[PDB]
């Protein structure tokens, strides 16, 4: 707006392209332990097993479990 | 055998129409500049009408090739040549016809400068490659071709803007006439078995896998470095870039075409077994093209550096899509051919007008255009869209049949090709956004025109056209389908 | 106020395609360029909307569309 | 601004407070439902409606599609 | 609990194949009056709780069975 | 009298009989085949 | 002040020229060698071995043997 | 000229074709590649109008179309396979 930098000194190679506190590195890790935190979620998930404490048995259609209207063979 | 076509309106008359024009030019002083601008632009328009009637007498039924008319070269009547179009090269000459008026029209302003040499390179790049385009032996597409090379080098560097036109040249010249000369080998080879050049002869032989195998990489080596194929696409840069607006549509709208046309018209049918085999190899150099190209592409500071570079994503996009070997495979390529051939002729006549006013190419000086040109940045946002494949415009109609095509047959080579979504929307807006966003800069630019009457009439083909394929693509498929579907089949019985 | 009072434009800002209206009661002189294209431009909608249109279809498609029909109908009357 | 008063747009830029708006406006009113009319007849030509409706709708009064696709053996 | 809709009356009613259980008999009244309602939700209340209360002994059922089920699981693991 | 029934017939008048375009091609494929020998004696001629 | 052609920016021209003429400054170092035999060798071999794998695969699902290519 | 109609072409292969020898008669070659293309654009034909049977089942039957569409996709799936120029050879 005000006034464009009409530059005084040779540009750089890498002039055409050119997250301030923390490191490049450091934030990776940050970030891989926080997508870790999901990983052992998931195991704890598989340790509870839940499939196995389901308080109730599976439906059971009626007509061969709905065989003929899910497209089986009349 | 004299092949006479019943029908009115044939090839070798819109053969001779610009050719009559540049005779007549020949012959008018340098001092009537209205005559000779008017002479000039009145011949291409009717060569344009005359094939668009040529399009109306168009059978879309038959496998066989149309108004076929032969002209006879020794009253021996051994070498006897033929013309005819099929639904294949039916719109390329179309495109050829309507790309000319185009440059004429560019270069309107500056035509007392420019002289009639102008308007007479441009009428014989006309004659030379809509007859390319129409013939029907391997013998003339050659010669015919290698012809282009000396209106196209007189182009480039008589009405190049700066010094750099004078390596570019060369380097056009040289890079085609290398491939020219390994087909005309192939040509030979070809001729030493067969005892002829007759198109619709060879596509009746059959050739050993062994023989097919060397024929094909004779051919593959005229026809990579037309694409462009890598590594031998380092000439198209320099010379598309350096070369003048009509020159730079020219070259990027037809004569990139060639390439492929000849893959279609030429490789694919006479060695069928060969094109199998190769197959991976050309699905590998196309993917390369496609990823390393488009970042480059993503790293260019001039504005025709940027239009040029994306032109080889195309081209190997299309290379993908006619080796696919099917209806939406060859279909697609045709159509993103004629697409492209519009969308980035419309980019280089966008940047030509950026130029003709501020001469220069550089991205930085420009930005804030959208506050003083706002029909300029209106139309260059519509042509941008098109070159990202923006569904509703043209290229996505061929782009996404391609990929249809390729995923067919081999999903990894879809997978990479479908990159190109990414990698050329990152770059085409980003070069809109830098060129026409943003805020001026007044230290560099402050005295702006928007388009005059002339700029936005060579612009409204353009859309009608670009909207016309995107929507109801179904005018052009339903010409081509006989001829793909043939081509497609040939070589198998089953 | 914005919608019951006026506005100020008396004619628009700029001028379509930069051109200086030309002077009162005169017309527009036409560049040389100007009559050809847009004779071509109404010839060729023209062309293209009628012959087009008019063009018998002989699309494959549409022959081998009326093909099959026939061989489903021949095959399903019979057996 | 000032150089922007030179400057010709589709969108009228900045600020446009055109004279005779309210005019303008009606007439792109009329000429919107005027395009929109011939949408419209070509809409009700076009439509299928497989099911008949519970209770009766607006669009039994103009569309005549109405339990045509029974018989799906014999689509083409 | 038997079934009582027939396959030809779920059909006709065009049943969601999930509630094709041996509770549509009361799903196709309730369904009827919730289209005649516009599915206010103040409406049909007879029709929704006799349903509701057919597809709650459903679970239950199926509650019981797996309360039977999981003391026999029991019974093996004190006998190894 | 109507535009598109005229237009009709004038583009029919416009095109290839289908026909005799697909028979000329017949004519030169065999004559070509068979065509094919006469040159390539005259290419094994002794210079001697 | 006078004219549309754009005031030239020496230092811009500078590095303009210098990204068209950058053939002259490659020297064969360590890093272009690793740069390109990874990028000019060796993953274009790792893309066509993976295009020729996908129809071997293919030709193995369709009980066939393999397609012979190149 | 062309007269008004759609376009004819024969019924049957050519008469001259031989499948074990095609590069033997070259006229015959050509024709019979343009009847097997023209085959194959009838089998095209037929998968897209078994096609518009599947859609209008689904559309007209519902949640049955699983137990009323089942003939309608089993006819139009097996005339997908090994249709035109896709996925399948012959
Ligand atoms: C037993 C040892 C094995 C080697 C015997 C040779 C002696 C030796 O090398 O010195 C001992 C040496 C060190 O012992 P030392 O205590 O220093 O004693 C030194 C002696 O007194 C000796 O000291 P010296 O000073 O008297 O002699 C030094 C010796 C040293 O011997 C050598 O020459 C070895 C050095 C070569 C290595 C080169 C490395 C490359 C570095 C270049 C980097 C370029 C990259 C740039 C990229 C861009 C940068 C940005 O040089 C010679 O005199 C030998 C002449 C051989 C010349 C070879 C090339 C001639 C061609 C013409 C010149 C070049 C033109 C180019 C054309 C190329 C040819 C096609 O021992 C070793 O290094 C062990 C070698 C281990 C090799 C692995 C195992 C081998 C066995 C495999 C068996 C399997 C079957
Ligand atoms: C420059 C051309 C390469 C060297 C010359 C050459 O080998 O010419 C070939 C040019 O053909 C090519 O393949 C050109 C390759 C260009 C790439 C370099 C023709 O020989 P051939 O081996 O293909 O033919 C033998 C045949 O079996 C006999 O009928
Ligand atoms: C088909 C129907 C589509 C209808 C969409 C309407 C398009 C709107 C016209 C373009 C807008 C325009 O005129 O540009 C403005 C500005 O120009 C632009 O911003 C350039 C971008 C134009 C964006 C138009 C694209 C609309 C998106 C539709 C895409 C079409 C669908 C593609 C597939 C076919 C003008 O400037 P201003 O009046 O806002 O004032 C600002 C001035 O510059 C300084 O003050
Ligand atoms: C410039 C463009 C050149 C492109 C190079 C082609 C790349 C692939 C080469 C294939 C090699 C090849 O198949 O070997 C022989 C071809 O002759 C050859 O060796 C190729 C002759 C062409 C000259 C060398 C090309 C590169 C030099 C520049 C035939 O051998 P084969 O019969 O075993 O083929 C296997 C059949 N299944
Ligand atoms: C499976 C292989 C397929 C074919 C590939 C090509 C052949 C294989 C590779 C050959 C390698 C030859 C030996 C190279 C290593 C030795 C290095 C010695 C030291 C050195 O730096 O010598 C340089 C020699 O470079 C040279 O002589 C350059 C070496 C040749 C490079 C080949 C590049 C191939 C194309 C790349 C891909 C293109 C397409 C990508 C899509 C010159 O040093 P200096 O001191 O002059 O340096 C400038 C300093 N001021
Ligand atoms: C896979 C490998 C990942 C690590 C790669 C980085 C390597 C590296 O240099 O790292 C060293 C890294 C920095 O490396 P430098 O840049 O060389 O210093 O070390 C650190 O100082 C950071 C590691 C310690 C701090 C992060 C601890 C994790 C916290 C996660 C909390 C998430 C909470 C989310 C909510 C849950 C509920
Ligand atoms: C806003 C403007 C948008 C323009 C798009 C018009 C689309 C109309 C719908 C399409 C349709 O139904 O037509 C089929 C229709 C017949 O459809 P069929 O019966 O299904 O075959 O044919 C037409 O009506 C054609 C349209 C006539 C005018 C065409 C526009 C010509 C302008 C210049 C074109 C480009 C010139 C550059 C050279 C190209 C060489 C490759």
């Known amino acids: ?74 | 055998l004299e092949h006479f076509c019943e029908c009115y309106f044939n090839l070798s008359g819109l053969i001779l129409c610009p050719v009559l024009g540049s005779i007549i030019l020949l012959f008018i002083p340098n001092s009537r500049i209205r005559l000779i601008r008017l002479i000039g632009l009145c011949a291409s328009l009717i060569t344009f009408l005359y094939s668009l009637v040529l399009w109306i007498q168009f059978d879309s039924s038959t496998a066989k090739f149309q108004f076929v008319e032969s002209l006879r070269w020794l009253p021996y009547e051994n070498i006897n040549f033929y013309l005819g179009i099929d639904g294949i090269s039916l719109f390329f000459v179309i495109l050829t016809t309507f790309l000319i008026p185009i440059c004429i029209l560019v270069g309107w302003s500056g035509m007392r400068s420019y002289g009639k040499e102008y308007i007479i390179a441009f009428l014989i790049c006309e004659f030379l490659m809509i007859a390319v385009f129409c013939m029907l032996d391997l013998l003339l597409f050659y010669v015919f071709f290698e012809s282009v090379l000396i209106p196209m080098f007189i182009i480039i560097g008589v009405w190049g803007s700066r010094q750099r036109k004078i390596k570019a040249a060369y380097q056009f010249f040289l890079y085609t006439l290398l491939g020219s000369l390994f087909m005309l080998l192939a040509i030979l080879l070809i001729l030493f078995q067969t005892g002829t050049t007759d198109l619709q002869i060879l596509l009746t032989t059959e050739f050993s896998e062994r023989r097919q195998i060397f024929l094909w990489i004779a051919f593959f080596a005229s026809f990579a470095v037309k694409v462009p194929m890598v590594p031998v696409h380092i000439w198209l840069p320099e010379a598309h870039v350096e070369a003048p607006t009509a020159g730079s549509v020219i070259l990027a709208g037809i004569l990139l075409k060639f390439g492929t046309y000849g893959f279609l018209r030429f490789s694919i049918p006479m060695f069928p077994e060969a094109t199998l085999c190769f197959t991976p190899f050309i699905y590998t150099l196309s993917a390369i093209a496609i990823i390393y190209t488009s970042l480059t592409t993503l790293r260019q500071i001039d504005l025709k550096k940027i239009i040029a570079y994306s032109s080889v994503a195309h081209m190997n996009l299309v290379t993908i899509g006619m080796f696919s070997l099917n209806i939406q495979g060859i279909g697609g390529s045709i159509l993103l051919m004629l697409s492209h051939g519009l969308v980035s002729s419309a980019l280089f006549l966008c940047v030509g007008v950026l130029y003709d006013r501020h001469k220069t190419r550089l991205v930085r000086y420009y930005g804030g255009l959208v506050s003083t040109m706002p029909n300029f940045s209106t139309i260059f946002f519509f042509f941008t869209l098109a070159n990202m494949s923006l569904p509703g415009t043209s290229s996505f109609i061929g782009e996404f049949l391609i990929l249809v095509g390729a995923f067919q047959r081999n999903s990894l080579v879809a997978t990479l090709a479908a990159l190109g979504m990414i990698l050329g929307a990152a770059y085409s807006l980003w070069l809109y956004n830098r060129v026409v966003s943003g805020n001026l800069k007044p230290d560099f630019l402050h005295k702006f025109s928007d388009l005059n009457g002339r700029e936005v009439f060579i612009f409204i083909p353009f859309l009608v056209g670009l909207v016309w394929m995107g929507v109801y693509p179904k005018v052009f498929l339903d010409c081509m389908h006989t001829s793909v579907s043939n081509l497609v089949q040939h070589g198998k019985f089953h | 106020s914005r919608w019951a009072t006026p506005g100020h434009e008396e004619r628009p800002k700029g001028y379509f395609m930069n051109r200086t209206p030309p002077a009162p009661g005169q017309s527009r002189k036409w560049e040389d360029w100007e009559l050809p294209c847009y004779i071509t431009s109404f010839l060729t909608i023209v062309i293209l909307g009628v012959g087009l249109n008019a063009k018998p279809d002989l699309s494959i498609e549409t022959w081998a569309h009326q093909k099959a029909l026939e061989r489903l109908e021949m095959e399903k009357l019979a057996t | 601004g000032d150089f922007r008063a030179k400057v010709w747009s589709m969108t009228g830029g900045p600020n446009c407070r055109p004279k005779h708006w309210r005019r303008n406006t009606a007439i792109a009113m009329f000429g919107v439902f005027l395009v929109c009319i011939p949408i419209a007849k070509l809409s009700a030509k076009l439509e299928q409606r497989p099911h008949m409706p519970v209770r009766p709708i607006p669009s039994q009064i103009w569309c005549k599609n109405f339990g045509t696709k029974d018989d799906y053996e014999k689509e083409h | ?80 | 009298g109507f535009i598109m029934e005229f237009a009709e017939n004038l583009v029919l008048r416009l095109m290839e009989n289908p026909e005799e375009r697909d028979r000329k091609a017949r004519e030169h494929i065999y004559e070509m085949h068979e065509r094919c020998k006469k040159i390539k004696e005259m290419w094994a001629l002794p210079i001697r | ?70 | 000229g062309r007269k008004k109609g759609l376009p004819e072409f024969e019924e049957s292969a050519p008469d001259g074709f031989d499948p074990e020898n095609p590069y033997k008669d070259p006229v015959a070659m050509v024709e019979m590649r343009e009847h097997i293309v023209r085959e194959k654009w009838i089998q095209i034909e037929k998968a897209k109008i078994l096609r518009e049977k599947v859609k209008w089942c689904y559309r007209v039957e519902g949640v049955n179309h699983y137990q009323k569409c089942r003939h309608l996709v089993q006819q139009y799936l097996d005339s997908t396979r090994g249709v035109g120029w896709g996925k399948d050879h012959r």
């Open chain 5, 1 to 80: 609990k038997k079934m009582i809709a027939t396959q030809e009356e779920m059909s006709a009613a065009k049943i969601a194949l999930g509630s094709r259980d041996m509770c549509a008999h009361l799903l196709i009244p309730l369904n009827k009056c919730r289209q005649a309602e516009f599915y206010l939700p103040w409406k049909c209340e007879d029709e929704r709780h006799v349903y509701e209360k057919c597809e709650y002994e459903l679970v239950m059922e199926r509650m019981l069975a797996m309360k039977k089920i999981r003391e026999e699981e029991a019974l093996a693991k004190q006998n190894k």
């Open chain 1, 1 to 74: 707006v005000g006034k464009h930098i009409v530059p005084d000194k040779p540009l750089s190679v890498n002039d055409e392209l050119m997250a301030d506190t923390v490191g490049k590195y450091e934030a990776l890790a940050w970030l891989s332990g926080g997508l870790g935190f999901f990983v052992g979620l998931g195991l704890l998930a598989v340790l509870n097993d839940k499939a196995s404490k389901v308080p109730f048995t599976p439906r059971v259609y009626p007509y061969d479990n709905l065989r003929v209207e899910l497209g089986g063979e009349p």
């Open chain 7, 1 to 70: 002040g006078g004219g549309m052609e754009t005031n030239k920016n020496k230092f811009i021209e500078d590095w303009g020229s210098a990204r068209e003429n950058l053939e002259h400054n490659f020297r064969w170092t360590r890093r272009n060698f690793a740069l390109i035999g990874i990028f000019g060798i060796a993953l274009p071999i790792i893309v066509y071995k993976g295009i020729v794998k996908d129809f071997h695969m293919q030709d193995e699902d369709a009980g066939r043997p393999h397609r012979k290519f190149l």
